[PDB]
Scaffold this motif. Structure first.
Motif, mmCIF file in Angstrom:
data_model
loop_
_atom_site.group_PDB
_atom_site.id
_atom_site.type_symbol
_atom_site.label_atom_id
_atom_site.label_comp_id
_atom_site.label_asym_id
_atom_site.label_seq_id
_atom_site.Cartn_x
_atom_site.Cartn_y
_atom_site.Cartn_z
ATOM 1 N N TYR A 128 0.711 -1.301 0.217
ATOM 2 C CA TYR A 128 -0.203 -0.126 0.049
ATOM 3 C C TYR A 128 0.721 1.568 0.008
ATOM 4 O O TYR A 128 2.301 1.294 0.439
ATOM 5 N N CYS A 129 0.804 2.308 -0.639
ATOM 6 C CA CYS A 129 1.042 3.291 -0.549
ATOM 7 C C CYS A 129 0.735 4.039 0.426
ATOM 8 O O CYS A 129 -0.188 4.615 1.163
ATOM 9 N N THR A 130 2.396 4.261 1.153
ATOM 10 C CA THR A 130 2.128 4.974 2.812
ATOM 11 C C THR A 130 2.005 6.554 3.034
ATOM 12 O O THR A 130 1.625 6.996 3.463
ATOM 13 N N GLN A 131 2.601 7.054 1.809
ATOM 14 C CA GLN A 131 2.427 8.875 1.859
ATOM 15 C C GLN A 131 0.972 8.926 1.305
ATOM 16 O O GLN A 131 -0.106 9.665 1.859
ATOM 17 N N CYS A 132 0.132 8.510 0.712
ATOM 18 C CA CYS A 132 -1.134 8.107 0.828
ATOM 19 C C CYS A 132 -2.255 8.220 1.463
ATOM 20 O O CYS A 132 -3.740 7.413 2.015
ATOM 21 N N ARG A 133 -1.388 7.166 3.104
ATOM 22 C CA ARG A 133 -2.481 7.000 4.154
ATOM 23 C C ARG A 133 -3.226 6.218 3.276
ATOM 24 O O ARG A 133 -5.113 5.723 4.469
ATOM 25 N N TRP A 134 -3.317 4.644 3.105
ATOM 26 C CA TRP A 134 -3.453 3.801 2.644
ATOM 27 C C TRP A 134 -2.955 2.562 3.632
ATOM 28 O O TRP A 134 -3.549 1.206 2.990
ATOM 29 N N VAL A 180 -2.383 -9.996 -8.252
ATOM 30 C CA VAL A 180 -3.576 -10.475 -8.269
ATOM 31 C C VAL A 180 -3.955 -9.555 -8.142
ATOM 32 O O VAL A 180 -5.067 -9.863 -9.169
ATOM 33 N N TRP A 181 -3.475 -8.528 -8.602
ATOM 34 C CA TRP A 181 -4.866 -7.135 -8.563
ATOM 35 C C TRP A 181 -3.893 -6.078 -7.950
ATOM 36 O O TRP A 181 -2.977 -6.221 -7.170
ATOM 37 N N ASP A 182 -4.113 -5.073 -9.455
ATOM 38 C CA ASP A 182 -3.292 -3.935 -9.081
ATOM 39 C C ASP A 182 -4.654 -2.961 -8.970
ATOM 40 O O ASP A 182 -4.962 -2.608 -10.030
ATOM 41 N N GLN A 239 -7.764 -2.356 -12.222
ATOM 42 C CA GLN A 239 -9.082 -2.704 -11.235
ATOM 43 C C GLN A 239 -9.224 -1.635 -10.625
ATOM 44 O O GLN A 239 -10.218 -2.629 -9.968
ATOM 45 N N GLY A 240 -8.941 -0.605 -10.261
ATOM 46 C CA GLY A 240 -9.373 -0.408 -9.215
ATOM 47 C C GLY A 240 -9.026 -0.127 -7.715
ATOM 48 O O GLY A 240 -8.386 -1.264 -7.372
ATOM 49 N N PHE A 241 -10.357 0.081 -7.160
ATOM 50 C CA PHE A 241 -10.325 -0.082 -4.951
ATOM 51 C C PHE A 241 -10.422 -1.780 -5.290
ATOM 52 O O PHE A 241 -11.337 -2.740 -6.107
ATOM 53 N N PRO A 242 -9.645 -2.190 -4.404
ATOM 54 C CA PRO A 242 -9.881 -3.918 -4.602
ATOM 55 C C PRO A 242 -11.229 -4.297 -3.944
ATOM 56 O O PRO A 242 -11.043 -5.004 -2.187
ATOM 57 N N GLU A 243 -11.757 -4.155 -3.755
ATOM 58 C CA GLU A 243 -13.716 -5.024 -3.078
ATOM 59 C C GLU A 243 -13.340 -6.368 -3.081
ATOM 60 O O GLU A 243 -12.850 -7.033 -3.821
ATOM 61 N N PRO A 244 -13.742 -6.425 -1.525
ATOM 62 C CA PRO A 244 -13.497 -7.450 -1.297
ATOM 63 C C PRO A 244 -13.947 -8.570 -1.581
ATOM 64 O O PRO A 244 -12.695 -10.148 -1.825
ATOM 65 N N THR A 245 -15.121 -9.121 -2.603
ATOM 66 C CA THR A 245 -15.540 -9.712 -3.113
ATOM 67 C C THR A 245 -14.494 -10.199 -3.975
ATOM 68 O O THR A 245 -14.017 -11.388 -4.380
ATOM 69 N N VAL A 274 -0.925 -3.407 -4.005
ATOM 70 C CA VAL A 274 -0.923 -4.156 -5.414
ATOM 71 C C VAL A 274 -1.749 -5.451 -4.382
ATOM 72 O O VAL A 274 -1.051 -5.695 -3.006
ATOM 73 N N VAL A 275 -2.098 -6.820 -4.420
ATOM 74 C CA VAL A 275 -2.559 -7.155 -3.928
ATOM 75 C C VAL A 275 -1.732 -8.884 -4.228
ATOM 76 O O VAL A 275 -1.463 -9.292 -5.682
ATOM 77 N N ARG A 276 -0.650 -9.643 -4.251
ATOM 78 C CA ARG A 276 0.374 -10.437 -4.490
ATOM 79 C C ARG A 276 0.747 -11.677 -3.684
ATOM 80 O O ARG A 276 -0.518 -12.166 -2.642
ATOM 81 N N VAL A 277 -0.323 -13.196 -5.181
ATOM 82 C CA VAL A 277 -0.886 -14.785 -3.932
ATOM 83 C C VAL A 277 0.503 -15.602 -4.457
ATOM 84 O O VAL A 277 0.814 -15.669 -5.465
ATOM 85 N N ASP A 278 1.525 -15.426 -3.517
ATOM 86 C CA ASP A 278 2.900 -16.402 -4.358
ATOM 87 C C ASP A 278 3.311 -15.934 -5.079
ATOM 88 O O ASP A 278 3.935 -16.667 -6.112
#
Lengths: 79, 80
Positions: free
Chosen positions: A9-15, A56-58, A62-68, A48-52
């Motif tokens: 997560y971007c630290t500066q963006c307070r995420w 898997v998500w950027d 793909q925008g905001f990481p909607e849970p589902t 971004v979300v990484r699996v192994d």
């Protein structure tokens, strides 16, 4: 526990808070399949979300990481 | 600097583990490469800094933010 997940997560963006939230969502759904989930402070606008090691998500793709949506992409990698 | 938090999954301690992660990441964001959450067995709640255990629940009790942040600063970089 055999798979690893990482959230950068971007630290500066307070995420940090939304990264932490997603971590809880994923850890609660895949607690039995994940060896650990790591939070990596990032540069700018990064989320971004990484699996192994595989992304898997950027955010800027793909925008905001909607849970589902993101939970489904994470599950496919841990059928 | 890598920090790790192992919380007892059965004890429903994910939320408090997540909270501590946020506390530590917000205070040491510039000194940590990453902070990981590792699901644990039973009653387990330990904080590790560079593979070294810095806080253990059944030894020092609940991870009070200040107390644990001071011990983490001690490993990472002793400042104010």
């Amino acid at each position: 526990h055999t798979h690893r997940v990482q959230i950068e997560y971007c630290t500066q963006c307070r995420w940090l808070p939304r990264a932490a939230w997603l971590a809880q969502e994923l850890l609660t759904t895949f607690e039995t399949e994940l060896t650990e989930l790591a939070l990596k402070p990032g540069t700018g606008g990064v989320f971004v979300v990484r699996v192994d090691d595989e992304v898997v998500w950027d955010r800027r793709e793909q925008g905001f990481p909607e849970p589902t949506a993101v939970k489904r992409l994470v599950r496919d990698r841990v059928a």
